[PDB]
């Protein structure tokens, strides 16, 4: 009891066409949001009834007098709706929320490798001491949409809530005195160091040209400005302030 | 000719319905595992035969008298089956094994950015010496499912086989002696360091408040306990043991 | 009303079959590249016309007398074509250029975790000084396809354009003199350090067994050989050259 559609020709093709209107044939009305345009439905005998065995649906996502917008839905026997393609082209697997081009509710296993754009940012060349834990940096650079290291000379602005890994280093001067730097939230070191869900640390150093370092790992909020510098001005005097990046840098990587 | 299904009105829709049973119309039997519920088949003349030119199948994944579980399969002329949606809603691309929500047998190329949960964990605040290469840590924290840094005070348990990048640092005290720490597998440094598929290193330091560092990068196994500490009890007396994380930390990131 | 296909039996199934040939039934001719084999088309009334409301198409990608190759196309009302499955099985979401098994033209959002192969590589055991900023390394190791750290003893070769995070450390000897190492592009430090789109830094050290470190973050070109070493022979004499990896390493991770 198959259904065959056979077409011979240079430009002709076979079509199964499912059409939907509201109203009647002589008085049709426009499709409304949520209306099903049509579906391919599979059903299987289990011994008692014809059970849902998957389906492929086209469903309106806008009233058609405004715009023709639809989604495609793929359902399986068992889980139900498994995949959705929205009118924007965004795809959801395991979710109907199609915010990004691909949205997976669950884990993803890839046998090969993944390439993508990665948000990261840097500051280079500590040129002066602005405030406790706030160096002024000679330049910044960044990639992606999560971090902005170029707008402000005194830090990197987090643009999106997320998890970040941060390392700041600066060279000690020639005095032989103990120096250190620390990563801070707009110069507030305790705001990061006191959290139970982060790593925050820093070392001391004294040998000329060696690094003191500070590290941070954890979540940050949109509009947070991350800074780094000496804890106090008198210690800043014993650190190297100059343009070359080898004198000191901050590096921020978006981890998730 | 084209097959058109046209539906008007407020409640109904156009539906191509494919139904499958075993036995006969008189003696219907339940669908069995591997039975095809139905399909949309595309065929094309190549001069010799009507060749497989793509198809969308619904197939039973279980005897329906047991459970109604189906998959949807998308095949193309050339590679054959290309994508599968199992009864769990899990999707395989280039593979029929749908362990996770999405599984890709191959590489993935993304033009934008990817957000997900990234497994990482930390120990902070080395407060006593437990054993060679094992500090007791005041607290731990972790994110995700691969690393457990809270159950035990003397290290982080690797919960999933994978690749990890680990850095451990600790401050020298005031003795002036050369000190160091090392990352180890439950106190066994050699079990990590002697492998030809890993990075393992460590530095010495002596300046008060300077950091001695140890690094590892490589695969670890489920149930591994990663520790870090001084190599012998006598050197521990020359390292800083106290609660604040700037005195010492261990950080573990899952890389793959 | 609905179109029902129903089949009872153990061998056959219910199937909509769309067949395409060129020529005529009396003289059929092979399908040609670009020919539509068939489609499942949805259409909806918008007030004045039956508008395209999504469709699933099978389309030839090759002249069938050469080879049977098709793609499957998923179109929604609004964006038009949203997903392509090429004859290779490669899937494109928002792109028809299906270079990898899965290609996404946009961002990806995953609620869980992603596992994949990660390109990374290392060099261990600085054994001798080959030239400025080029140590010879006793061994290397790598995983993935972006980086080769074993073919050349003097560095890691970048095999794919990408963004890389690199850290090089080496132990100071016992001279008491200031020492440092630097990461370089086959010995050329300036080729990396002078770029406005990268991080490049290095520290000094003098304590025996402590690390001098150099760091890099940024894009690199295929065929780049990344080296690390002392800036001149007389400073190499003041660094530790020996086989154990704790004497010196280089670590490279592909970031994107
Ligand atoms: C101790 C010190 O500052 N020495 C610097 C060195 O670090 C720097 O790499 C080089 C410029 O290439 O200039 C030297 O004078
Ligand atoms: C060890 C040292 O000399 N200096 C520490 C400094 O590292 C620490 O960060 C600060 C409290 O925040 O307390 C000082 O005593
Ligand atoms: C003073 C010195 O160099 N000590 C080394 C130590 O760095 C190294 O980690 C260990 C190997 O287990 O062998 C010791 O001799």
Numbering used by the authors:
A (entry chain C), B (entry chain B), C (entry chain A): 852 to 1107
Task: Give me lines lifted from the publication on this model.
Structural studies reveal a variety of domain usages (and therefore binding capabilities) at the fibre C-termini, placing these on intertwined trimeric β-prisms. Using independent but complementary approaches, we identified and characterized a MAT superfamily of trimeric fibre proteins with diverse adhesive tips, able to fulfil the long-sought-after role of multiplicity of molecular recognition and handling of diverse epitopes (across a wide prey range), by the bacterial predator B. bacteriovorus.
We next characterized two more divergent NS74s, Bd2439 and Bd2734, obtaining a tip-only variant of Bd2734 (residues T691–L843, 1.8 Å) and a longer construct of Bd2439 (G837–D1107, 1.6 Å). Mapping a sequence alignment to Bd2439 identifies a conserved interfacial pocket (Y1031, R1040, E1044, H1053 and H1055 from one monomer; R1022 and Y1097 from another). Bd2439 showed strong binding to Proteus mirabilis OXK glycan, with weaker (but significant) binding to glycans from E. coli K-235 and Serratia marcescens. Our demonstration of a MAT binding pocket capable of recognizing two adjacent hydroxyls presumably explains part of this specificity, but the ubiquity of this feature in surface glycans and relative specificity of Bd2439 suggest that multiple flanking pockets will provide additional selectivity. The fact that none of the single-gene-deletion mutants were significantly defective in predation on Proteus mirabilis hints that there are multiple factors and several MAT proteins involved, but our GlcNAc-bound Bd2439 structure identifies a potential motif that may be used (in part) to select for saccharides in Proteus mirabilis and Proteus mirabilis-like glycans.
